[PDB]
Symmetry: D3
């Protein structure tokens, strides 16, 4: 049985912007993926609202630095056959840094953290790694969000090509989330239930391919 | 559907001391518990080898301080109907502090962290909390472990009464893991597959009662 | 006897831009408030030079992140009847982030830290919270300050309406410091002695309302 | 006008072993000292429950490491003429270390933090420093306190001679708190209102001498 | 025998923009300086790739905050007669802050860390300090570097005048690295072996004067 | 040219207990090693007073936790052919934990940090590692040191066999420092000049074997 860790942010937690709540379990993209793989895989969802690739954010009751937390998560869930990353939307906040390029460097650090992890028990081989570019940000009239993410429509559109290029450099899998799903203008960043499911459905082929099914 | 977070250490990760590996999924105590509750619950396993209640340990590629990490875990998995804690065995290490009493103060801090958590979305009510005393340590001839855990047979036997008393003070549920399961002398701390399953089976009644089924 | 905590930056410390020293005790705004309230209240001044709302700044011999520090301050001075915040001027520094919106998010975090604090002795009545928008930045010939706070005159002008909107959203009091006081052009950011006294006199009515005298 | 910082733990916060509450303001030791000195001095009380000399403790909603926190506190209250420390009780907990010697080394570190602090504004001359040994622990039937402070009766009796020797070595003032006050057997470590008040008065003469009145 | 600490970033580590490797030992600037000074001095090279003046950067397997790390480095190498800093290039990254002004404030903080360091053994007299502005960035067709350092050409040209003014303010030595060396257009920021060697030689005269030979 | 990193504590710094200062350069063990190897090797000395294997100590102006610091040191000095560890004396302090077993676990962690380090430039050949057991503690009349290291004579005697067993388990080299050198009874823990030189001379053969000269 293959074990798949899904390491993400609110898009992976399953933020429902319509209701200001959480999508149902069955609508979260790791759950869609699990259903599709069935008993051949065990998928673990680790989605944290506001998680950045590598940067500190002290505005919530959690540690939002993806890189600082990842070793603890890897160790909790080892041994792992596949890590699926979907991060970068929070990196588009100017407070964090706002740059597509800083997001791709953060993913690079996360890839290295997986590759160099000191596993809890003796482990022959590195997990495989799938880098997913999140669905790009959209324009919103929500004044708080448009400030929070000022300039991020334009920068977030550059994540797919950069993340694809990194995945090629680092021998990782790549999927463009924005190829199957769009964000909502309620806030410019979140996915409704249908678009969240779509990410899960869309990943099934590359996930199967990376796992040898 | 009720959501149950199981926050523990190697006993919850499912450490196989016979094989120096991880118990199969179906033998881990959260998985036994999930099977028993079926579709009425969604159980989330967060077991980290070497996790202490509240103390730092820099000897592995993770953060083993249960209290520092817990907010991030709570936030990842909210909203939660029940938190089940099973920690304290690592607190028996003299390097950490070695005292049953320090372990119960650490559980107290963890209870407070749940109760005061700033949830990712609007939340009316605190989760319920179930404090589980881990199966007590046994004597071992393994010289590394007997040093690591020097004096912990005697101190670990005091966790059940202290944890029961705390649970009464704080309006938490209580279960003695050591009432259904024993540790293995391979290393004096771990649970074999059968004893791990037993913890899961044994918790089903109090978990159902706390969840209203 | 009501206890009031005043949590702020060099404006609350009492920075004298003319002498590069500290205003006399009696000219600091918390002192002016205390004299106005008399023996009905005990006012505690916690102003730290360079303190930001919720952002790291490693340029001085102290932790300038207001959010990281605040729990320890709350705990030291508990039980509290009112917390008065006056922060955001340092958030106007580009190196911090330079945005009004980032400042009001930081105040939001501070409010939540108060509301969720695990008080040292049983409580049960939450403190009241007063959000004070600092007097906004002005233009200065001081080239070092003009650089340090580049863009800040325009952003700081936005703090009063954003803070007022937040106070309303979160059930806090609001006062616009800039309604009674102005910054000195010697450096664009500080208050002279009279302007520091004006803040303290200006807060007396809203402070009484919130304390029931 | 001389400014005095009082940097301590629950004995300085003013902990009531009975009510489980806070001593009234006028019954706290820095308040007694303030009343004695009158307008010749401004006394600032910074007493945090559980504060250690220089050791982490993650069991409460605050940073209990005296050393970490002290630069922030110094910077907040500068310029200072005198720092009065009264710490060491918490160091008697086996979870912290439980040794008089570790406490005096902690005090040393706090002394050096004062001496090397990079003050907010230009400052010629260091503050004076007064080291206070806390009143020693006594035996208690309170079994949680007896556990928490196990061994502390015998170790805490060593604080006064070690602290006095250090003060001599480092050119600091010294006062033995236990000379004028005793702990309550209600819990073995705290001070009742009368004995708290006595510390403040007892310190008056040495504070006066160090300050030239 | 004088001891000189060289505290820098990849320009001091000796980064080869081509080979993506390390300059040979004799081609690094502190080695050149050492060879020039001969047995009158012992030069210690502490160059860390990506090191900033006083800003966190979690993108590599190390702490890149110059300020955090420097007390440890000072303590390791004390007693020191001279500290030579060459930092600021990394501060030109928009992810760090991207401002010449933020870099000079960072340098200031490093100067004060040297001046206030609590040396391992008794030490009368501070080390001398030499601030080196790094050679300024140049334009590059390398699109990853151009992104990473966007804006840095124009800002890095301001480092020399700001650093010189600071050195005057703080009674430090100053040298403009860009006076004797140029960055490579291969990536816009690094130094080839010849230009690296030139910094070391260029520093010789001012190092000699500060040390009295 | 081989590069050798020497990572240790005040024994590697070169602490002179008679003068409370630092041994001359030429008497420090890494210097003696360097002279013995000549131009075939470049030896880097990183000895920090009070450094522990993997444990926090906040009593000085530095980070004494060997494991927290080591990645930054590896990264600064990479690429390395050999890392030589000489640590554990500070681990014999009760405040740290006082156990030989805790010291060898800390060395274990350090070894793993080396083996998993994300080197700054492509590598691919792992450095060799030499574990050196420090000369064991002796009895002393110095009452402050006798307290600081209470129990340490008996525990430190156990470091050589435990370290040798570890070296064998992990494929590292081993040398017993105590085979060529002894501690001074002036304070029980330090080495005088000749005894520090003896360590350096003593390591030459195993250092050559591991470097292939």
């Amino acid at each position: 049985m293959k074990t798949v860790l899904c390491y993400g942010d609110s898009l992976t937690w399953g933020y429902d912007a319509t209701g200001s709540g959480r999508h149902a379990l069955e609508d979260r993209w790791p759950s869609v993926l699990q259903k599709a793989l069935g008993s051949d895989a065990h998928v673990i969802a680790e989605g944290l609202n506001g998680r950045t690739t590598a940067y500190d954010d002290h505005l919530a009751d959690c540690d939002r630095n993806g890189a600082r937390v990842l070793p603890t998560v890897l160790h909790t869930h080892a041994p792992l056959d596949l890590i699926v990353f979907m991060l970068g939307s929070n990196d588009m906040k100017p407070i964090i840094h706002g740059t597509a390029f800083g997001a791709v460097k953060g993913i690079e650090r996360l890839v290295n953290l997986v590759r160099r992890h000191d596993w809890p028990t003796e482990t022959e081989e590195g997990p495989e790694i799938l880098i997913v570019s999140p669905p790009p940000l959209c324009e919103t009239a929500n004044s708080a969000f448009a400030a929070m993410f000022a300039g991020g429509v334009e920068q977030s559109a550059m994540l797919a090509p950069l993340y694809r290029d990194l995945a090629d450099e680092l021998d990782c899998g790549f999927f463009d989330g924005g190829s199957v799903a769009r964000t909502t203008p309620i806030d410019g960043v979140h996915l409704d239930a249908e678009n969240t499911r779509a990410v899960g459905r869309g990943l099934e082929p590359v996930v199967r391919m990376m796992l040898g099914l």
